[PDB]
């Protein structure tokens, strides 16, 4: 069934899911609006994203 239907899908589907794993590198626009927002955001999962 897997061979016939080939439900290929990356394990990441959410920001928290992205934060849990570390194999795939992350990032955003350097000195961009997004990363500046990540400053002081202090969400329980986005602080680790900032680091």
């Amino acid at each position: 069934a897997f061979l016939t239907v080939e439900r290929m899908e990356s394990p990441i589907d959410s920001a928290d899911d992205l934060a849990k794993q570390t194999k795939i590198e992350y990032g955003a626009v350097e000195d961009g609006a997004t990363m500046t927002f990540f400053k002081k955001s202090k969400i329980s999962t986005y602080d680790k994203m900032w680091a």
């Binding site: 080939e6 290929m8 899908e9 990356s10 990441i12 920001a15 992205l18 927002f37």
Partner: protein, 50 residues
């Protein structure tokens, strides 16, 4: 702020610093941060593969 160009139709985000100096109209479009990553072309890695 100097009123040289009164209208500012442009993709300028409504930020607190900008709003202090110039007022913005209501957002025609509400943008937000998302996650960008390639299309999932699944590959099966050995032990997980079988």
């Amino acid at each position: 702020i100097d009123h040289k160009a009164d209208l500012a139709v442009a993709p300028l985000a409504i930020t607190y610093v900008r709003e202090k100096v110039i007022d913005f109209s209501k957002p025609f479009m509400t943008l937000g941060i998302s996650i960008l990553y390639r299309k999932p072309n699944g590959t099966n890695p050995g032990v997980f593969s079988f």
